[PDB]
Amino acid sequence: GSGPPGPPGPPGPPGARGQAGVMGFPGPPGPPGPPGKEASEQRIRELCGGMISEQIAQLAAHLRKPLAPGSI
Amino acid sequence: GSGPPGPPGPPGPPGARGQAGVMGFPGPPGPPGPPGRAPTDQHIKQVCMRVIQEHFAEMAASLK
Amino acid sequence: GSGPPGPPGPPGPPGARGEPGNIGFPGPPGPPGPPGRDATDQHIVDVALKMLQEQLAEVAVSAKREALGAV
DSSP, rough: OOOOOOOOOOOOOOOOOOOOOOOOOOOOOOOOOOOOOOOOOHHHHHHHHHHHHHHHHHHHHHHOOOOOOOOO | OOOOOOOOOOOOOOOOOOOOOOOOOOOOOOOOOOOOOOHHHHHHHHHHHHHHTTHHHHHHHOOO | OOOOOOOOOOOOOOOOOOOOOOOOOOOOOOOOOOOOOOSSSHHHHHHHHHHHHHHHHHHHHHHHHHHHHHO
C-alpha cells in the first residue's frame, strides 16, 4: 500500500431529534358556583299575604271573634 | 516513492440523540360550577303555608 | 514507479447532535367546580313571620280605631 490512506469519509448523519415533551398536567377544578339567589321580600309578600289574611280570618271565626269584613 | 491515495473512507456514525423536549403547560382551571337553586314561587308558598300552620297557637293568642 | 493505491481512508466524523425534542401539548382544562349552594328557606320564613306579626298587630289597631270611628 505504497500510497497514502484515502481521504476521510463524509460526516455521519445528524442525530435523531430528542423524545417529544409530554402533555402538560390537567388544570384544577373550577371554583364552586354562586349561591342560589334568595327571593325578594316583595315577592314573598305578594305570594303569601293573601293566605296569611285568609287563615287569620278563618281562625278568628273559629274563636268567635270574626273580624272587619275582608275585600271581595 | 508513493502511489495513489486510497479510496475515501466510510461515512461517520450518526450524531447523538437530542435532548428531550419540555413538558407542555398545565391546562387552565375549569369554569365555575353552576349557581345554586333559587326558590320557585310554589316553594315560597309552601314555606309560608308551613309557617302559618306552625303558628296557629300564636295567631289565636292575638285573635282572642 | 508507482506502488499500489493506499488503503481506504478513515471513517468520517460523527454527525451533529440531534435537535431537542418537540414541545409538549398543553394539558386539559380542569372540570367545572361544584354547584353553588341553594338558597335556604330561612329568608322566606323570616318574611312570613314578619308578615304574620304585622297582620296580627293590625287586628288590634283595627278594633281600636273602629270603636273611635277613625279608621
